[PDB]
Nucleic acid binder design. Sequence first.
DNA 1: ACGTAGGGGAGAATTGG
RNA 2: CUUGCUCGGUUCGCCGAGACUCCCCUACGU
DNA 3: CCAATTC
Length: 279
Amino acid sequence: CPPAKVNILAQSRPLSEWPINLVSKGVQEYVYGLTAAEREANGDFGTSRKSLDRWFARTGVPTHGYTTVQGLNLILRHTFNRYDGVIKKVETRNEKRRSKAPEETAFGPDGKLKERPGINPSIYCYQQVSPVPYNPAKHPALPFSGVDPGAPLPLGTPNRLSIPKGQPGYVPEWQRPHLSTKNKRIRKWYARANWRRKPGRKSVLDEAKLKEAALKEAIPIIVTIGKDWIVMDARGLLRAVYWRGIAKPGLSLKELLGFFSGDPVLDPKRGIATFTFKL
DNA sequence: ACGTAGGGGAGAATTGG
RNA sequence: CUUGCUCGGUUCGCCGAGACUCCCCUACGU
DNA sequence: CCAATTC
């Protein structure tokens, strides 16, 4: 199950103000700093509505309007597994000590866990919120158009030589001999690997011209949690199914992300979300 | 600032109002 | 083989050559 | 139609 990465196009509000992130951060901030007696007392979290509904009342963790069951089970199983990770580490670090031969516990005089886990900013998606083809009617308004999910996707730049002179993608005459006779990736005109600062490049970088060219031919997929929608560029998905030999040139969007899981993992600060290959 | 070293993590197929 | 990314040619129009198991967090060397 | 239940 190898990973594939996708760039983000637009979102209404940033991922910090998302209730799914705020609830996770609030839950994580409350749990890591708990004594070994508090984790067992407060570990009475189930996989049911009524179990989680009152768990916030007893523990007092803020709720920012997040009540979805599976979303809560993706930030409560994980938070207690990170908590157990430090104790298991010093217990597996106890295991190496045991092999060599009181102990090196993970609780100080205050009783708290001294090597407190850091807050994990990953926002884990679930089945009820999965990427779908961006339909202009159902989903909110965005400038970039959405493709039909049933029609096959276009093949990128066929017959590169047969491109008008003076129009983007033109291969000059002195350069047509000694071209790649073997198959490789076909980089686009607006590719940044052709336009970047190099001692030998006299060309001018203009980020406005290139980036606008990039999203007109984009492949948008959308994930909506509450009243927040994130829209992406499903071309890293397309390249992943191309350089790996699992796909052909003509392939529909509905079938493109069927290769991937319905649970993307987002990176709020880096601006990238990672897919995986469902097997 | 950097290897390292070592804990966490990366669905989906029914069922019920 | 439409994005992204590393290393090179270049007539600056784009070309050839690559990588693709990654993110988070706590620690310890230089 | 889509969260809660479930492994």
